[PDB]
Design an enzyme around this catalytic site. Structure first.
Site, PDB file in Angstrom:
ATOM      1  N   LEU A   4      -5.560   4.542   6.232  1.00  0.00           N
ATOM      2  CA  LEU A   4      -5.807   4.324   4.812  1.00  0.00           C
ATOM      3  C   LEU A   4      -6.103   2.829   4.872  1.00  0.00           C
ATOM      4  CD1 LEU A   4      -5.382   5.543   1.740  1.00  0.00           C
ATOM      5  CD2 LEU A   4      -3.199   4.337   1.970  1.00  0.00           C
ATOM      6  N   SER A   5      -7.291   2.447   4.417  1.00  0.00           N
ATOM      7  CA  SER A   5      -7.702   1.059   4.594  1.00  0.00           C
ATOM      8  C   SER A   5      -6.940   0.134   3.651  1.00  0.00           C
ATOM      9  CB  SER A   5      -9.209   0.914   4.369  1.00  0.00           C
ATOM     10  OG  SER A   5      -9.670  -0.352   4.809  1.00  0.00           O
ATOM     11  N   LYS A   6      -7.015  -1.166   3.917  1.00  0.00           N
ATOM     12  CA  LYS A   6      -6.270  -2.151   3.142  1.00  0.00           C
ATOM     13  C   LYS A   6      -6.977  -2.469   1.829  1.00  0.00           C
ATOM     14  CE  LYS A   6      -3.821  -4.962   6.531  1.00  0.00           C
ATOM     15  NZ  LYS A   6      -3.778  -5.199   8.000  1.00  0.00           N
ATOM     16  N   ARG A   7      -8.150  -1.875   1.636  1.00  0.00           N
ATOM     17  CA  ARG A   7      -9.060  -2.302   0.580  1.00  0.00           C
ATOM     18  C   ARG A   7      -9.310  -1.178  -0.421  1.00  0.00           C
ATOM     19  NH1 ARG A   7     -13.586  -1.987   5.113  1.00  0.00           N
ATOM     20  NH2 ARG A   7     -15.168  -2.845   3.690  1.00  0.00           N
TER      21      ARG A   7
ATOM     22  N   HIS B 147       0.824  -1.203   0.000  1.00  0.00           N
ATOM     23  CA  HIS B 147       0.000   0.000   0.000  1.00  0.00           C
ATOM     24  C   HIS B 147       0.862   1.258   0.000  1.00  0.00           C
ATOM     25  CE1 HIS B 147      -3.391  -2.617   0.686  1.00  0.00           C
ATOM     26  NE2 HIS B 147      -2.873  -3.056   1.818  1.00  0.00           N
TER      27      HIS B 147
END
Lengths: 481, 485
Positions: free
Chosen positions: A254-257, A16
């Site tokens: 910050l999301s993983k998705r 990411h």
């Protein structure tokens, strides 16, 4: 000099952008100080995806141009550089710590710690209570007889615990406030708490730059780093610098998705490395007060992590795009053209122009996209097998008066000796402004729709040139109806 | 790239008050079209009206155009083949043309007051519609003579044709006024003096104008002016009918013509603030027009090469100061450093803001600020700490940065500055790094802020170490020492 920093990802998941910002920050700080960038793999915890994730990590570095001086394939003097390869090392460092009285075997169950808290009138939410520091040899042997498998804990200093963070400034943990912490699991296998400071120590890391999400580990690590000096396995403590966590549009990690966190999304769309690195560099840092557009060399010259701020860094996909666009336009035409050909080609999106006409079309669109991927929509009318007239356009530009324009335009264009760009212009404004007397934009419009399928395209006439006479005539003639 | 062949266009202001952006846009748009087409830009002064017009306005008009770097081919000063070019000098021409119109029966003397459509009488058709009477068309010579004897003073009106009046506006496309929808209109006032309804098409006809490019606020005059142009051909004064191209009135926040109250409307407000001609030209060009679909930054020569008024769009053109500011800033960067330096010195100087640095120092200072302003006027607050008579410590910044955290920083910075062997930004910076960041262990942000406020008086400035260089050792020490106290 000689600075030594470390990018030490665990092989899990896609890289990411936050993770990739940290890699860049370390890379730039090494290159700026003339120091060394160490690439360590934290793969003592394997999952199904770990090889996949490994390959993704090296690919990411290799795409953005961030080479490593020590680490995988390339090796170095403080190897090995996979932690899965270092178990002998971790067992001997643990033996040495134990022998020196820096660590101890601990046998308490959670329930037993709970109970001691309760007997004390304290709240059992508190952690480990350092009980096992005072075990007798009798008590330790009795435990082993019953088949208790201990964990190893480090003995914390009992005084105040602080460091001067390179980003945050002085940070302080009150005396006694951090329990003796486990270095192993009951199976004996080492933990993040051991192998991360262990390897920084042994690999002579001078500066640890990492996401501020890890900041609570620092007092523990400093205690281990100090212990490791005592037992003679290092000589210096590293400085620490804790980067502002990269957020998405919300206030959330910050999301993983959310795809705007995933580096391959950006790449796939057609970010170029120059564009993405410029954007990443702005998550916690600015090169100057008067601009934010720059190359990696300029970054390397300027980058000092003491200039990283601890304020909120929120990912901004508008600014990203804007920076990439500029960086695309910054490329020399040849470079852009090879990159654009490759991107289209490798996405199943070959444009059916030969080398020379494609080069012409590339230079047409370089100023007219934000991402390499935008070129397919612009450009794809150049393949017969993608030509489709848009209904709207064919309703604006194709109707009754379309007939008038299609007619006169057909007259206009037939007779041109040469399908070279510089002429077709003059034929149509003659026919369609000149004698139909409507705006220059209806002179050329119904041509555009008839030629390209759309009201928006590349500059008309180069596009007609590159289409070729025969294909242009064919499409116009078919249009009018 | 095609034109008319002899394109002749005009800019024909009436001198009143200061030049507004709408009007200057029109001038620019005419000049760029002329030059695009190899054509002729005629500057005609519409000074018939003494109540409104002004030398002060005239002078301001001409200074505006020349500041922008426009010129004219016929007009004031240069003259030309179709003069004179003030309408005030031209009275005998208008009298002659009026006489010719009357003799030919294109116009008549009217004694009634001026039909306005507020109230009309059913036109006689199967579908009842409202129409104009135009009754005085039918007065007998005998009635008119009687009326004159009685002391009545007529105006001259043009007889409108009985057919539809349209034209193919180069911006707006076809516009039509159906037969009957425009009354016979006065060419004069009772005094005999001609109105703009006569003098504007008269002079357009007479100066052989081929294209009329003007604000769309004037668009309703066009059918009147069509009718007159047509009659002028009939009576031999005119040759052809000009083309018209009506430019989008520029829109405030409301939907309205940008107000002459609005500061944004005055060209000289932008000038005074430190817009440069390249900056303002660029933006004015963007009020109804774009050079290309991929960029909006361009110079005059590119504008000329590109501009055809038929590409102007008829959409809302909203004045946007942030945009104008941004394009001027870009144009300020674009300048060569030496050119920029002269303009900046001149601007400061003429505003009573001379900066007290020598030639080498001022040029270093100019390069620092070239990239850090949007208008020349911004230099002043940036730069003015270099003047001893302008040095002032911001109260908020002092209380913030020059309390007791304070002492260590300043003490160490004074030590270290003493130690600097040659007074140059890299040696000052090296000294200050090594005392404040290495020595005192401080975050650089925190490590300099007191230094900045001491040296400059404020917490944002030009790049610190270059600013210290240009102040000089003695001056830096003194301010830094005084802040210590």
């Amino acid at each position: 000099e000689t600075v030594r920093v470390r990018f030490c990802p665990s092989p899990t998941g896609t890289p990411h952008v936050g993770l990739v910002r940290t890699a860049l920050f370390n890379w730039a700080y090494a290159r700026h100080t003339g120091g060394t960038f160490v690439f360590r793999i934290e793969d003592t915890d394997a999952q199904r995806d770990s090889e996949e994730s490994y390959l993704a990590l090296l690919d990411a570095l290799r795409w953005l141009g961030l080479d490593w001086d020590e680490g995988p394939e390339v090796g170095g003097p403080y190897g090995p550089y996979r932690q899965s390869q270092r178990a002998e090392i971790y067992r001997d460092v643990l033996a040495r710590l134990l022998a020196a009285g820096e660590a101890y075997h601990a046998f308490s169950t959670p329930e037993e710690v709970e109970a001691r808290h309760v007997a004390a009138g304290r709240n059992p939410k508190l952690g480990y209570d350092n009980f096992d520091r005072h075990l007798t040899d009798a008590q330790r042997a009795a435990y082993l007889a019953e088949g208790r498998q201990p964990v190893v804990r480090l003995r914390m200093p009992d005084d105040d615990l602080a460091w001067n963070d390179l980003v945050r400034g002085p940070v302080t943990f009150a005396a006694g406030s951090v329990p003796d912490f486990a270095l192993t699991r009951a199976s004996g296998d080492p933990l993040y708490t051991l192998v991360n400071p262990c390897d920084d120590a042994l690999m002579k890391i001078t500066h640890v730059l990492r996401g501020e999400d890890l900041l609570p580990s620092t007092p523990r690590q400093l205690a281990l780093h100090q212990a490791l000096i005592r037992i003679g396995v290092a000589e210096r403590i590293p400085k620490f610098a804790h980067l502002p966590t990269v957020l998405g549009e919300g206030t959330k990690k910050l999301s993983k998705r959310d795809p705007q966190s995933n580096l391959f999304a950006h790449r796939d769309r057609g970010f170029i490395p120059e564009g993405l690195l410029n954007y990443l560099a702005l998550l916690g840092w600015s090169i100057a007060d008067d601009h934010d557009l720059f190359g990696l060399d300029e970054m390397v010259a300027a980058f000092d992590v003491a200039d990283v701020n601890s304020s909120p860094a929120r990912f901004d996909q508008k600014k990203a795009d804007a920076l990439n666009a500029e960086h695309i336009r910054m490329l020399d035409v040849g470079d852009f053209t090879v990159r654009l050909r490759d991107h289209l080609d490798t996405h199943g999106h070959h444009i059916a122009l030969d080398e020379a006409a494609f080069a012409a079309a590339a230079e047409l669109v370089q100023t007219r996209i934000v991402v390499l991927g935008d070129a397919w929509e612009l450009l794809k009318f150049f393949n017969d097998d993608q030509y489709v007239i848009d209904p709207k356009a064919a309703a604006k530009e194709l109707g009754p008066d379309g007939a008038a324009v299609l007619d006169a335009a057909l007259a206009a264009l037939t007779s041109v000796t040469d399908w070279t760009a510089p002429l077709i212009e003059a034929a149509l404004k003659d026919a369609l402004i000149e004698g139909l007397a409507l705006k220059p934009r209806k002179a050329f419009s119904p041509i555009r729709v008839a030629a390209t399928g759309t009201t928006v395209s590349p500059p008309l006439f180069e596009s007609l040139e590159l289409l070729g006479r025969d294909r242009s005539m064919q499409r116009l003639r078919a249009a009018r109806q």
